[PDB]
Amino acid sequence: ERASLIQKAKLAEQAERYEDMAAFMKGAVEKGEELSCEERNLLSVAYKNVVGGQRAAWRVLSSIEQKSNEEEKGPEVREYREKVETELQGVCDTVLGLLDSHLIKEAGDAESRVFYLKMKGDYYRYLAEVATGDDKKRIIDSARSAYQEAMDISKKEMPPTNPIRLGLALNFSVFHYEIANSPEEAISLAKTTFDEAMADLHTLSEDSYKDSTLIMQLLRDNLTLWT
Template identity: 55%
Template sequence: MSKWKSWSEFKLFGNCLLKSSIFRMTSSNHVAIARLAEQAERYNDMSFEMRKHIEALNGDISEDDRNLFSVAYKNVVGQRRSSWRAMCGIEKKLNDTDPKLAQVKSYKEKIEGELNDLCKEVLRILNDLLIPNASESKEKVFYMKMKGDYLRYLAEIQKESDEKDSINSAREVYQEAWNISENELQPTHPIHLGLALNFSVYYFEILDDKNKACDLAKKAFDDAISMLDNLKEDSYKDSTLIMQLLRDNLTLWSADGEDEDENQ
């Protein structure tokens, strides 16, 4: 004999079960769609799905989710940063009487508005959901490096007063992350090396402090080289790639310094 007393009772149970199943599937569905969006190179969709996923889980996400979140917004923001730099290049080539100048400035401001909104969206997710839920040092360093990056991107496009706030905030966040990373992560860890790379770029591009940029990049590279024999196989590719980028920057920055000396 059926345990259901009536069709309405069975239907009510079915609806409750369906709703609970949908609730359980929501987060994984967001990730599945985000992965499809990544393959289709539709990064706006990818970032939207990852934001919804993170909000659904209140910031308690896996390492794979963390990487998807980073990739999504890096591409969405990166595309607009490239567009903004292109407009800046065109603007510099035009004189004040050129009728195209107003159009270029207007379009550049449109891109700046999009960048501003996206960067603040990432910072909100980091501050409200991800950093408070970071239980391990590598998670905290990853998120704080990311926070420093998006404050740096804001500084690139902001006016002087707001720019100073973003510059100072970025330096504080990068430095705090660096202190944790130096004490608790291996010199060869990809997250440690990635932080060194971006923190040194901040010194070079934002503060125009070439000596500090070179010192930080060189220390990170030399420390990693000394520990290369202990590098784990699963992180070898990522670590050595970032080390190559550090070395490339050092070569480039050192060459810039030599060129300046010759011109003096």
């Protein structure tokens, strides 16, 4: 069954059926076994596509709700925006459940532990986008902690040019600016990360250079936007 779920997940990606992919990957994870670099990526692509479409949907329905509150689509927008929010919360809870009960625990390489802790921080960040009061602050603490535990491992056992490290630092600085309300901690983090990787670009093969400079460009783009 496990190989068959991984196969149908590769097929679901090709047909651009990401909720199907998501279900095939969750089932592959649930088998209890560890994920290879490939499986780890299929799990990331599946859910990032599922939740990305739910986030973009939520952004539109909140935009319409804001306008209708500027006065009378109001009752229908709130019911439906809350419906799309519950579907989002459920997808993030499925991912966070897979991370906390199977993936983070059963992780060997520091590289895969940082990968899963970046995922954990990300899904708590998406949860915090739509959260409101009591729950919002508890989610923001859970996001910070997971991003911090990952930053520590990546600083201690990963090169500054590593794309997981760069991607983690990018997401954490996005967390600081957008969620945690700290633009200075975001600019400080983004500049530092860009500079450390820049210093060691001279030691990368064609493929690695392309993978690192892609995320480095996103770091500096955000820097341009925030300054």
